[PDB]
Amino acid sequence: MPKNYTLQNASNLGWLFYKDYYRQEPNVDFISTQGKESDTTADFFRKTNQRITAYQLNSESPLVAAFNNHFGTPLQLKTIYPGLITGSGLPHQTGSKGEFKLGFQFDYTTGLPYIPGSSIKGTLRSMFPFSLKDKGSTKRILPEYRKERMEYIRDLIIEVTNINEISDTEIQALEYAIFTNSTPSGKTIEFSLEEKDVFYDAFVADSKDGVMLSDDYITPHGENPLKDPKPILFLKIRPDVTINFYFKLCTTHLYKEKVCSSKQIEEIKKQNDFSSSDYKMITAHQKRNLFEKILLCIGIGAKTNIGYGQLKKL
Amino acid sequence: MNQLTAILKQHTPMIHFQHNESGATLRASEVKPLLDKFILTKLGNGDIREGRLYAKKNNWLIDNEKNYALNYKLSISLQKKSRLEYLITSSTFPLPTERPSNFFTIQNSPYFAQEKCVGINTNSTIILKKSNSDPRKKEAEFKEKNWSQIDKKGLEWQDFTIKIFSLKGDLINKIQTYLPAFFICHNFGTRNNKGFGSFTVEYINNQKNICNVEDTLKENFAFVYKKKIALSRQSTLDFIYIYNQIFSTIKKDYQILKSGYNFRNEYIKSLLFCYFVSKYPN
Amino acid sequence: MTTRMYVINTLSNMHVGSGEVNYGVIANLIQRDSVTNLPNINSSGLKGAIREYFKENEDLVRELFGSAPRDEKTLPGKVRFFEANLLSMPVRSDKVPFLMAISDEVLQELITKMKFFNCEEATQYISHLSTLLDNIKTQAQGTDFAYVFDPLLQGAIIEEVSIRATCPSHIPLQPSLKKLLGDRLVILSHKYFSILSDDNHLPVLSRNNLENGQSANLWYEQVLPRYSRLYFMLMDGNAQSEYLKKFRDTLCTPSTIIQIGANASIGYGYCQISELSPF
Amino acid sequence: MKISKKQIEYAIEALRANNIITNDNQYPKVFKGYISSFGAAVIQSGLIPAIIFFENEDNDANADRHKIIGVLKDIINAMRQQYTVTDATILVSSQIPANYSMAQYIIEHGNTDQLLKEITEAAVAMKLALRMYKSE
Amino acid sequence: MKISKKQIEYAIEALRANNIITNDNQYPKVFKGYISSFGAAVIQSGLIPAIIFFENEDNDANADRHKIIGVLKDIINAMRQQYTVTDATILVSSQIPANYSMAQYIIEHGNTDQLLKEITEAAVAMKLALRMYKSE
RNA sequence: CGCCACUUCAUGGAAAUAAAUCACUCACGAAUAG
């Protein structure tokens, strides 16, 4: 019900978008071909879309406060205006006019728009060199891919932490420890429970003075420039919206070219043979800085090559 | 380098459908496909297919079999959020007296859509009204909500940023080479062919861009035709007046081309008509 | 001091994957109870997750959970972990974002389990839950029902246009029952709850695998919705009082979050465990 | 959920009847994606939206996309044909009229869970039966 | 389900026959998972869906997953041979034609109890016989 | 200068893929015989 999405007086956004969206009213038709194109159906879907994009989120919202309590301190970023699109491939269309033809990612329980942690993990890993599997259809792309990603991640690591030199093996071990929580060659490392990188679900945290959802058009003009283009309507997260990124990251210890846990690294330090030139460390703060720089560089969501889901610092 | 951070200048206002956001700027949904097409056309030395084979060999394509898309990330962001918002119509009407500073009127323009917002309708942005002293010389009034609910606004912003990201350095070098030509050749917006898309790039990677407009136009277009419009003094005042002259001249000339001009009292025949009735006079 | 009831409050989505090859839409389904077909956490998975949380305390894990798989000696586990049966499931509505959905048969199973296992604070809970059940049955008179206990939540659509809520102004919902079952509580007929909790209505999440920005795989995952409540029974064996007290204090603190199920690295299945509060 | 061999037989017969499997035991490649998309739409959006989307014949798609809805109706009719008198008192055993719109049939009969279960059964059967054939 | 040596020899011959074991006694590593997962698919999904899934040749599998269905058919056919033919015997000692796919045979011949037992035992023999070779 | 609109509203691709398929311990111990 109107603005200020709260746990007390508000309809579930996912329920409105997916379940209540295609509800049958006494005098609304979208089964026959005439009904889908009629202005009665357009008005029905316009009212539904207004209800969807008539909700605000306060900064001190109890939902976001609960998220902060559960998932630790958030990494807050802002939305540029292409908007932000997540879950675009979900099936949501009937062939009608004025309806949202693209899917959207809504949390089931809360209804707040969110980015699943899997999307964050994949986007962050995509700029790491070992995000591509050998397979055999990758063989040609694999050498160049790893090279450019190695250079990019090397400059990022030298930027964010006080390490003046890193190697390809060290980058491999760091990436595998961060994402797979293992070693590049299979076998695992005896990590502590705390020493584990978790990528929670990014959530909408603050729609300052406006709504959080907007409606946008992509109009693919066909390969025949003499035929009529297709207006496609979808739902986007509004620009200048605070998206909270929640992570559970640890400190990574790299001695020589291998990743070490804290228990192993204590004994390695206490050994009579040691080399500060071989012991590298990436603090959880520097890990968060690295992830923030990656997110600023590439962004999150769908249609990111078109620009959707790019961020600045808040 | 893996990033291209270009600063580009706005020459003519852009008609934007999503103007309700203060961050409204150039949409990369228009730039990226057109830029990909332009880049591949330049790669093949005028042929799109040869450029596609070129990008296929150098692994610059997202897909090597289906589409024309190149692998890079396009981002366009506003640096300063102040916008000069224009109303674009087809006829000339009396200007309002009460008027926000951001609001200017390009009345006689090729863009003839949304002509009804300067009517007597209650949904018109500028509601026309009879004058009391003279039962002519219509009066003008401004409705804030109607101007807020307009479908399309003509927007002009200050210098802003277009950011190009890719992990393929050679593609970035060729993008740096061809981006000024791309922006000098293409217009972006609604009715962009008539001039509501004009941009030029000033700084590419914090380096000034000495790109001759005439030479790039000569290269990428079959015919290029210059018209020196008499800039009656000014040139330091009333960019709104400059826009009015420019777009009134464009409407003049393009109405002359494919039609006549049965306006005031001077008649000049349609040159589109005169071409066909002369060549093989049937 | 022997048998205790713990409520699992899930802070995120939970996927306790069953070993199942579904050739329909959902590739990965969640575990369902062998009898009532409701979502549940197998006792083995719950024990493994809780043991993983306490792995640092070697003595506590050895005394309460048993010995490690790779050990010359094997030590029987002392504490007994029972499977976590579903108690409350959030359901999307129109008046409110989500209500806590329980069924009359779920309440009957809870009363039966409390009677059989003799939880610590079971007597008053059994009495009041029973009284609520007879009141609900007296009002329903056989027909399907959706009963809310706030007059503001009247006519609410419980995830389906067919299921509309009505407020019976004769059944009091005690504050402790509200704490146990959820804030915005709706009690449904078994037909309605089974419709809402079946494989066609549980929340599904879409995932794909990209190779250099191009999709290689695509599959759908079934998850138990966020803030869902599940109850499981803990039996103290002949365990030491000190280790048991440490285990209970760590388990029931507000700052303890336990990962149960799959997809730990992407945030699936982070839970808070709360002991049964006195009525 | 376990798909019966009888359901697969009905799916095979319906695929052959609504000219999807050719006389050479081959089918257009796009129908597998059609059926997968229908299943995803049914679980995500609902029965009414998915059936309305895939019942369309003015769709400019690469193939006759309404054929899967026809096959769905044929499978459901065959399923309802073998209903027992014990089932007929609880389930709607009536044969769905051939000319009748499937979405209209669902809407006029409410949104009962019976139709949803039948649709899901028939969709999975269509998926498996298509997997049984070759895709040229 | 005790180890049947004759079925193990049948599995060896069928694995060599359907081009799974190379001339050097090695096989693609993924086939181990195929054999292991076929039994679970049969038990918890049904025999027909599992056979259809593993018989498909339009799959995005790292190897030729359909070879295991051919090996299964060869083991079953070898078991149909050396069946004591008598009036009282339940077992049908009729060999599965090579032109028929395995999914069709169980569809057309609707006595699954024999086929289910034979397929389960043949899969166990498959898994036990695959261990004699190198897992490359 | 006066008047004024009609258009178009999803298609194509990916629909699961690999790893582990049980492991370790106990495989009889005493008593009755000699």
Coordinates of C-alpha atoms in Angstrom, one line a residue, chain E:
Chain E
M1 CA 22.3 -58.8 -5.1
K2 CA 25.4 -61.0 -5.1
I3 CA 28.2 -60.6 -7.7
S4 CA 27.2 -62.7 -10.7
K5 CA 30.4 -63.7 -12.5
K6 CA 28.7 -64.5 -15.8
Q7 CA 27.1 -61.1 -15.8
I8 CA 30.5 -59.6 -15.2
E9 CA 31.9 -61.3 -18.3
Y10 CA 28.9 -60.1 -20.2
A11 CA 29.6 -56.6 -19.0
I12 CA 33.3 -56.9 -20.0
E13 CA 32.3 -58.0 -23.5
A14 CA 29.7 -55.3 -23.9
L15 CA 32.0 -52.6 -22.6
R16 CA 34.6 -53.6 -25.2
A17 CA 31.9 -54.0 -27.9
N18 CA 30.3 -50.5 -27.4
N19 CA 33.7 -48.7 -27.8
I20 CA 34.1 -47.7 -24.2
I21 CA 37.4 -49.4 -23.3
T22 CA 40.2 -48.3 -25.6
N23 CA 42.8 -50.7 -27.0
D24 CA 44.9 -49.7 -24.1
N25 CA 42.7 -50.7 -21.2
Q26 CA 41.4 -47.2 -20.4
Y27 CA 38.0 -45.5 -20.6
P28 CA 36.9 -41.8 -20.3
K29 CA 36.7 -40.9 -16.7
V30 CA 33.2 -39.6 -16.8
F31 CA 31.7 -43.0 -17.6
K32 CA 32.3 -44.0 -13.9
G33 CA 29.8 -41.4 -12.9
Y34 CA 27.4 -42.4 -15.6
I35 CA 27.3 -46.0 -14.4
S36 CA 27.1 -45.0 -10.8
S37 CA 24.2 -42.5 -11.4
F38 CA 22.2 -44.8 -13.6
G39 CA 21.1 -47.0 -10.7
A40 CA 20.0 -44.1 -8.6
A41 CA 18.1 -42.6 -11.5
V42 CA 16.3 -45.9 -12.1
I43 CA 15.4 -46.3 -8.4
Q44 CA 14.3 -42.7 -7.5
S45 CA 12.9 -41.5 -10.9
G46 CA 11.6 -44.6 -12.6
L47 CA 13.1 -47.0 -15.2
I48 CA 11.6 -45.3 -18.3
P49 CA 12.7 -41.7 -17.4
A50 CA 16.2 -42.9 -16.4
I51 CA 16.6 -44.9 -19.7
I52 CA 15.4 -41.9 -21.7
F53 CA 17.8 -39.6 -19.9
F54 CA 20.8 -41.9 -20.5
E55 CA 19.7 -42.9 -24.1
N56 CA 19.5 -39.4 -25.3
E57 CA 22.2 -38.4 -27.9
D58 CA 21.5 -34.7 -27.9
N59 CA 23.1 -34.2 -24.5
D60 CA 25.7 -31.7 -23.3
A61 CA 27.8 -34.5 -21.8
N62 CA 31.6 -34.7 -21.7
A63 CA 31.4 -38.0 -23.5
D64 CA 29.0 -40.3 -25.4
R65 CA 26.7 -41.1 -22.5
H66 CA 24.4 -43.2 -24.7
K67 CA 27.1 -45.9 -25.0
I68 CA 26.1 -47.2 -21.5
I69 CA 22.5 -47.9 -22.8
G70 CA 24.0 -50.0 -25.6
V71 CA 26.2 -51.9 -23.1
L72 CA 23.1 -52.4 -21.0
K73 CA 21.2 -53.8 -23.9
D74 CA 24.1 -56.1 -24.8
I75 CA 24.3 -57.5 -21.2
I76 CA 20.5 -58.0 -21.1
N77 CA 20.6 -59.8 -24.5
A78 CA 23.4 -62.0 -23.3
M79 CA 21.3 -62.8 -20.2
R80 CA 18.3 -63.6 -22.4
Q81 CA 20.5 -66.2 -24.0
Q82 CA 21.4 -69.0 -21.6
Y83 CA 17.9 -68.9 -20.3
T84 CA 16.5 -72.3 -19.4
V85 CA 13.6 -72.5 -21.8
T86 CA 10.7 -74.4 -20.2
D87 CA 6.9 -74.0 -20.0
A88 CA 7.0 -72.8 -16.4
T89 CA 9.7 -70.2 -16.7
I90 CA 8.5 -66.6 -16.2
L91 CA 11.5 -65.1 -18.0
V92 CA 11.0 -64.1 -21.7
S93 CA 14.1 -65.2 -23.5
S94 CA 13.4 -62.9 -26.5
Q95 CA 16.4 -60.8 -27.7
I96 CA 16.1 -57.0 -28.0
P97 CA 16.4 -56.0 -31.6
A98 CA 19.2 -53.6 -32.4
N99 CA 17.0 -51.3 -34.4
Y100 CA 14.7 -50.7 -31.5
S101 CA 15.9 -48.3 -28.9
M102 CA 15.8 -49.5 -25.3
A103 CA 13.2 -46.9 -24.3
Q104 CA 10.8 -48.2 -27.0
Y105 CA 11.3 -51.8 -26.1
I106 CA 10.1 -51.3 -22.5
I107 CA 7.3 -49.0 -23.8
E108 CA 6.0 -51.6 -26.3
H109 CA 6.6 -54.7 -24.1
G110 CA 4.8 -53.8 -20.9
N111 CA 6.2 -56.4 -18.5
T112 CA 8.6 -54.1 -16.7
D113 CA 9.2 -56.5 -13.7
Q114 CA 11.5 -58.7 -15.7
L115 CA 13.1 -55.7 -17.5
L116 CA 13.6 -53.8 -14.2
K117 CA 15.4 -56.7 -12.5
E118 CA 17.6 -57.4 -15.6
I119 CA 18.5 -53.7 -15.9
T120 CA 19.3 -53.3 -12.2
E121 CA 21.5 -56.4 -12.3
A122 CA 23.2 -55.4 -15.6
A123 CA 23.9 -51.9 -14.1
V124 CA 25.5 -53.5 -11.0
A125 CA 27.6 -55.7 -13.3
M126 CA 28.6 -52.6 -15.3
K127 CA 29.8 -50.8 -12.3
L128 CA 31.7 -53.7 -10.9
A129 CA 33.3 -54.5 -14.3
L130 CA 34.4 -50.9 -15.0
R131 CA 36.9 -51.2 -12.1
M132 CA 39.2 -53.6 -14.0
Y133 CA 40.3 -50.7 -16.2
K134 CA 42.2 -47.5 -15.8
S135 CA 40.1 -44.5 -15.0
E136 CA 41.7 -42.0 -17.4

